[PDB]
Nucleic acid binder design. Structure first.
Ligand SMILES: [Mg+2]
Ligand SMILES: [Mg+2]
Ligand SMILES: [Mg+2]
Ligand SMILES: [Mg+2]
Ligand SMILES: [Mg+2]
Ligand SMILES: [Mg+2]
Ligand SMILES: [Mg+2]
Ligand SMILES: [Mg+2]
Ligand SMILES: [Mg+2]
Ligand SMILES: [Mg+2]
Ligand SMILES: [Mg+2]
Ligand SMILES: [Mg+2]
Lengths: 61, 145, 70, 143, 135, 79, 206, 67
RNA sequence: UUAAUUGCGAUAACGAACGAGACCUUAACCUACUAAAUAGUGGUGCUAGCAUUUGCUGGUUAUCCACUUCUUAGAGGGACUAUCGGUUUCAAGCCGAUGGAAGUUUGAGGCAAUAACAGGUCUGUGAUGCCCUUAGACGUUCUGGGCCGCACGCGCGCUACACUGACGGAGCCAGCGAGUCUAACCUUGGCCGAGAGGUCUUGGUAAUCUUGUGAAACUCCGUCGUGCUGGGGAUAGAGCAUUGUAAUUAUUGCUCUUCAACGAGGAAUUCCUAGUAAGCGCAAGUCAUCAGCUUGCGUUGAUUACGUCCCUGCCCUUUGUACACAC
């Protein structure tokens, strides 16, 4: 069960040709120290903790 | 109600007026298995022949339902009115029947033949396969044969 | 299966083998368990409601819910 | 304890009490029952047919007590649901007139309905009496 | 003299020293029977104030709307009823003790649900929706 | 006395209502719902184009011895 | 427990539930934890409600249906496939039926074995359509704290909807026989079979 | 949605030039000031001049506004 | 920057006209005044019922006083994004919040410019140019048929494949409306009829009467049991009614009987963001009779987005052109 936590620090914006995805900066909490930009599907705002299936190697566009 | 068991006196397969009827089926509808026996007219005779409707078809005796065959082919003499009858006032003899089993198609045939040979509209219109009831015929009713 | 509409007893005192390790019982449980069809399963849920192990939790027409000898 | 019908629920009172008029047998039923549906705007004759004149007679008196004066027509509007007009839109169709009139009759043959001096049907002089009577029958063993 | 409203259902009550009988329509509240919405009507009195409503003026009658605008209307009457005899009557800090507990759960009891239904424009069976198109 | 008065415009409808509660003190002595009549037809004279509908409206507002015959001198009527 | 009465006999059962400790009418709306830290703030137990019909404006502004009592939330995704539209009263009777239809299979508060059945019904990752077109790539993107909720609802209602259809069982009996498995490691539940289906080339396309 | 047009902005500053004698940072005071000296037609018309005149006032303290 | 050629600003432009907006309409509140058997409530006179310190429920067609909260419409009040923060880039504004009946121009409409189209209408005009016809008439009337005609393709819809259902009792809740004297409109209540419907009264020119329009979905209680079944009601037979000089090619309604396809619809494709979608019925137009249509009105009341320019496509610049009957 390779999972990890991540709450969204800020919302970089949207991408996707139809406009239904958001770029987010993120971190895992205790000894926070992470920052990586994942793209996310349903609506998301600040401090929304969310899942992750590999702790790094995010994307863009 | 509550549970009984009963002995082996139930049946599937039971032929009554040339038509076998399923027995595992509850009663008043296993009667509609006969042409001419609808639901209004099946619901009534079997109460004005004094039977309990909660029972499936598997019970009963011949004169418990000869109670119904002489009811159904001679109902004018059994307190059921004339507006329940698929043939009332006739046109051959003026007396009111109830066409049943085979009798429906046959005295339907007479109804069509009486018009088809008189060259009435409905007569040769029936003889063509077209709608006798005045409905539109361009937009509707196509795939068929 | 083709299912059944009367109350002999082949697996129908499995109609009395009718509680342990399957608590909830109602019409749907009766028909499924390699068993009856479900219109005599309504007087029967009325029959063991009369005096049986099944006790009513549910007060409504559309579904009855009955449990074990809890 | 000072019981009117308004303090007993409708269904269990209208129904379990309608069995009282069976218990007595002061009937005057029409006898054309076993051939009726209560409306053109429905399809099957009433399921039971062993009763339901009591339930109907209960029902009308409950509304007649609960308000001032009733009429034969308004009975048809009330019970009459929607005719399944087949393949066309459903509509409100009124109910059987003969059915409802013959219950507004057979109820002042018992002393529960009056014939309002204004026209219509008043709850009778003694109707306001025996209706509240069945309340404490039902209530004082239903708490 | 309190209001009650959901859409076109309106419910009425009154303010003076009272009875104990809490009357719905004429058939008192005990059973109203849109069967399970009874807890909708029961709801107000239960945060605080469970009794001494034998000095209480609660007759309520409902007209208009339907089987659920009336249930929402009557609670709009009853709840505003209590804080009504707490205006220049038994202390007004209790107004701010009920308007406190009612409104801090307010499922449209003190403040009327403003939601009214939209006029339908032509070319459709609706205010917003439209007939089907064919090119 | 009892008068019932009606018109479509409201001003000269209420320039008599006030003008009669002031003859009410002529020797220091003693609103209906508005009816909207709706005609709803098509804008187009023939049959063409977008199927466009158009409601019109009439607004009808109604209200309610020697001095009697010299008070009646908008739709005036009294009984 | 403060039993008390007035001129209208108040049924005793009502007075000993709410004013004693402000419950829901039968089921203890009281403390029930969420077994997924990302639904912290995305679930509305406490404040309790006695009936699942608090008709309120949870739509005209955006995120508010987060604050809707998360049990009235699901009583809404049931009244559809077209015929059942409207008809909340038909829906809320299915839920209070299903609660003790659940409760007759091991006790302790079915108000949780529903939420215990959505945290493992939320798809962690998901895959959607690139600009592309025909030759379009399927890049994975992780899933929202609120989408994981919204969609595990309609996923759960749907599985019941199409299994109640034409089968002898009841609609309350279906989603009861479906909510329970999603409590953990279902492997035999419709909505779980779809969340686990939906995580497809999921941690690979990232 | 909420952009006031030159009908208000011209009229709203048409006052502040002739009546900075008086005029306040509170809306409802100017509300009932307006119709005394102006000839606005509708209430919504006046309430929007007032809402902006007050807005120019709530900011007039800290630096004069162009024009 | 705004929904906005809406504003801030920037400026060889300045100052101005229409369009946007303002406006008018309707939906929200209002314990503020004026007020009321054509609207209600409370009280009281008189009376039914229930248990009895007098309590519940009614009736009370002036049975007298009082009230104006529900209801009607006059005069008006009210929101102006007020206030507080976050934000801006000085600004115009945008975002959050508290407050509030109300904070997407508050919700929804009416109005709507310049230039155009060979768009549609001479089948609305006793509007009309020219042409054709004018007595064996293309005028007009009368009789009778057709516009409905059925190997087939398509557009708007109605009804359904069911167990969140059908049916039977039962509960019982709206709003917008229309309605009769050079006359027979809307119809309560009494009987008769299983029904459709029949009949002798009756009220209303209508906040009064029909009408609380006791609508339908819906709600409580039962029956049915998975398969074309009691789902579905097409087709057709027989009989009874209603409209109308006239029902045949069934006008429509009713009764019994007959009981088809349809087991959730391929490629395609419409509509929709809140009391909205969809479900449900009702009135009005039509109308002698006939709604599966339309114009509205309320009842039940969600899911899903509060985003993009991918497709379809509008607007504003800049750009290229061999286009100008304009890709
Ligand atoms: Mg009914
Ligand atoms: Mg009905
Ligand atoms: Mg094409
Ligand atoms: Mg234009
Ligand atoms: Mg042309
Ligand atoms: Mg011409
Ligand atoms: Mg034609
Ligand atoms: Mg079309
Ligand atoms: Mg059927
Ligand atoms: Mg039903
Ligand atoms: Mg399109
Ligand atoms: Mg038409």
């Amino acid at each position: 069960t390779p999972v990890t936590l991540a709450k969204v620090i800020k919302v970089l914006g949207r991408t996707g040709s139809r406009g239904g995805v958001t770029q987010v900066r993120v971190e895992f909490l205790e000894d926070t120290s992470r920052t990586i930009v994942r793209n996310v599907k349903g609506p998301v705002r600040e401090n929304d903790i969310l899942v992750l299936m590999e702790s790094e190697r995010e994307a863009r566009r | 109600s509550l549970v009984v068991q009963e002995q082996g006196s139930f049946q599937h397969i039971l032929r009554l007026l040339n038509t076998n009827v399923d027995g595992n089926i509850k009663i008043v509808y296993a009667l509609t298995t006969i042409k001419g026996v609808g639901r209004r007219y099946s619901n009534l005779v079997c109460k004005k022949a004094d039977v309990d409707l909660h029972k499936r078809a598997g019970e009963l005796t011949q004169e418990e339902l000869e109670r119904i065959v002489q009811i159904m082919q001679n109902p004018t003499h059994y307190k059921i009115p004339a507006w329940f009858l698929n043939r009332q006032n006739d046109i051959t003899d003026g007396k009111d029947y109830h066409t049943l089993a085979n009798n429906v198609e046959s005295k339907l045939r007479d109804d069509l033949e009486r018009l088809k040979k008189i060259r009435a509209h409905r007569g040769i219109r029936h003889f063509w396969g077209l709608r006798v009831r005045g409905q539109h015929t361009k937009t509707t009713g196509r795939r068929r044969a | 299966a083709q299912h059944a509409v009367i109350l002999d007893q082949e697996k129908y005192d499995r109609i009395l083998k009718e509680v342990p390790t399957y608590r909830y019982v109602s019409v749907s449980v009766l028909v499924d368990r390699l068993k009856i069809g479900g219109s005599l399963a309504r007087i029967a849920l009325r029959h063991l409601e009369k005096e049986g192990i099944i006790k009513p939790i549910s007060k409504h027409s559309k579904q009855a819910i009955y449990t074990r000898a809890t | 304890p000072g019981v009117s019908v308004r303090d007993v629920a409708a269904q269990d009172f209208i129904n379990a009490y309608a069995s009282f008029l069976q218990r007595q047998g002061k009937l005057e039923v029409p006898g054309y029952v076993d051939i009726v549906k209560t409306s053109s705007g429905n399809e099957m004759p009433p399921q039971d047919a062993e009763g339901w004149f009591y339930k109907r007679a209960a029902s009308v008196a409950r509304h007649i007590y609960m308000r001032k004066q009733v009429g034969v027509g308004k009975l048809n509007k009330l019970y009459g649901g929607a005719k399944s007009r087949g393949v066309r839109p459903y509509k409100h169709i009124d109910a059987s007139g003969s059915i409802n009139r013959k219950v507004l009759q057979a109820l002042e043959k018992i002393g529960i309905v009056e014939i309002s001096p204004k026209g219509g049907r008043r709850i009778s002089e003694n109707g306001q009496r025996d209706l509240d009577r069945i309340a404490a029958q039902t209530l004082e063993e239903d708490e | 003299q309190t209001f009650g409203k959901k859409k076109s259902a309106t419910a009425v009550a009154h303010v003076k020293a009272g009875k104990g009988l809490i009357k719905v329509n004429g058939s008192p509240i005990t059973l109203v029977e849109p069967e399970i919405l009874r807890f909708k009507v029961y709801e107000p009195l239960l945060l605080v104030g469970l009794d001494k409503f034998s000095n209480i003026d609660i007759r309520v009658r409902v007209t208009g709307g339907g089987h659920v605008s009336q249930v929402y209307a009557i609670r709009q009457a009853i709840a505003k009823g209590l804080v009504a005899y707490h205006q220049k009557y038994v202390d007004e800090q209790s107004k701010n003790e009920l308007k406190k507990a009612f409104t801090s759960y307010d499922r449209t009891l003190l403040i009327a649900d403003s939601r009214r239904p939209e006029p339908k424009k032509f070319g459709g069976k609706g205010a917003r929706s439209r007939f089907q198109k064919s090119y | 006395i009892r008068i019932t008065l009606t018109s479509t415009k409201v001003k000269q409808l209420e320039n008599v209502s006030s003008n009669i509660v002031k003859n009410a003190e002529q020797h220091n002595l003693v609103r209906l719902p508005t009816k909207v009549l709706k005609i709803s037809t098509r804008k187009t004279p023939n049959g063409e184009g977008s199927k466009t509908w158009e409601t019109y409206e009439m607004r009808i507002h109604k209200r309610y011895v020697q001095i009697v015959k010299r008070i009646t001198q908008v739709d005036v009527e009294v009984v | 427990f403060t039993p008390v009465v007035l001129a209208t006999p108040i049924p005793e059962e009502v007075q000993q539930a709410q004013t004693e400790i402000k419950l829901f009418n039968k089921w203890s709306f009281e403390e029930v934890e969420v077994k997924d830290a990302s639904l912290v703030d995305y679930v509305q137990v406490r404040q309790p409600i006695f009936v699942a019909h608090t008709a309120g404006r949870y739509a005209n502004k955006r995120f508010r249906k987060a604050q809707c009592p998360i049990i009235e939330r699901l009583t809404n995704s049931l009244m559809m496939n077209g015929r059942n539209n409207g008809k909340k009263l038909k829906a809320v009777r299915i839920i209070k039926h299903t609660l003790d239809i659940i409760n007759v299979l091991t006790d302790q508060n079915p108000i949780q074995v529903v939420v215990d059945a959505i945290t493992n019904t939320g798809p962690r990752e998901d895959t959607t359509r690139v600009g592309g077109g025909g030759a379009a790539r399927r890049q994975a993107v992780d899933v929202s704290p609120l989408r994981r909720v919204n969609q595990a609802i309609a996923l759960l209602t749907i599985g019941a909807r199409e299994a109640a259809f034409r089968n002898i069982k009841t609609i309350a009996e279906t989603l009861a026989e479906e909510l329970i498995n999603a409590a953990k490691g279902s492997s035999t539940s419709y909505a779980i079979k779809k969340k686990d289906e939906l995580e497809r080339v999921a941690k690979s396309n990232r | 949605g909420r952009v006031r047009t030159k009908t208000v902005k011209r009229a709203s500053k048409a006052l502040i030039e002739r009546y900075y004698p008086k005029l306040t940072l509170d809306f409802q005071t100017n509300k009932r000031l307006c119709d005394e000296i102006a000839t606005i037609q509708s209430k919504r018309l006046r309430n929007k001049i007032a809402g902006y005149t007050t807005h120019l006032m709530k900011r007039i303290q800290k630096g004069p506004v162009r024009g």
